[PDB]
Amino acid sequence: IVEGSDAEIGMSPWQVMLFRKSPQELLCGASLISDRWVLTAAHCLLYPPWDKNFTENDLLVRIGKHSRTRYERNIEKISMLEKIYIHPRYNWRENLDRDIALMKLKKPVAFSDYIHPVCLPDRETAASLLQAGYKGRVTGWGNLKETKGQPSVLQVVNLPIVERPVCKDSTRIRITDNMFCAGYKPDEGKRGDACEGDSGGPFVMKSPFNNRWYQMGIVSWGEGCDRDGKYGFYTHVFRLKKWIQKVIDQFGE
């Protein structure tokens, strides 16, 4: 996260760390959506140009974390994956369209002060909150600036959603309906962006209707981090909600 701040304890209890077994390394962020299921970005798992193709046994997820590096005893939970499901039409060749993946834990994880699932948006919640100027929140342990710059604890930044045609005109990459962008504009004075290692983490908004946190986006892509006139792009979770439900139903709640 560029230009964010340290998270408060328990601020984002759905935040998941995707951790490589060998060699040990932070891969990506992710989010807990039930006691068995974790949502992340497809490109965190599969990116053929870099020969990236992680399977279930290559990875672990770490849940309930605050410190980036320390084993947080009696706080974090470490789970192995039973299965990974990547969207069939994920588009690694061009713009990471449908940059979404689901991971099923081998065993259910117990909830606590530090571990708690986020909500997925319904139609009305998405229609209400996904509007230009409305801010969502992004969290992660990714780099503090465009490429050490590694944070010691979880970072958080609040960012305004941007109008589709501004997102459109800001980049030469083809934008689809399955993405939205966010961040401040050059003239807004404030700044901030997700950055490397934040991918697959959640973009969340707090609903004024029921005071629940909903995951509207998945940190997906950008051209560098925090450049003036550039914005961060997020997988549109509601647009993909049907596929998420299909997978969970078919492969076990």
């Binding site: 601020m11 699932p117 986020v118 801010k135």
Partner: peptide
């Protein structure tokens, strides 16, 4: 989950984090 999106250390205790107000403010003004 019927309990999703409600944080044990915040919503469940009627506490707000240091910046969630910023989100709500953006929805209103």
């Amino acid at each position: 989950e019927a309990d999703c999106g409600l944080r044990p250390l915040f919503e469940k205790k009627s506490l707000e984090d240091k910046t969630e107000r910023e989100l709500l403010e953006s929805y209103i003004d």
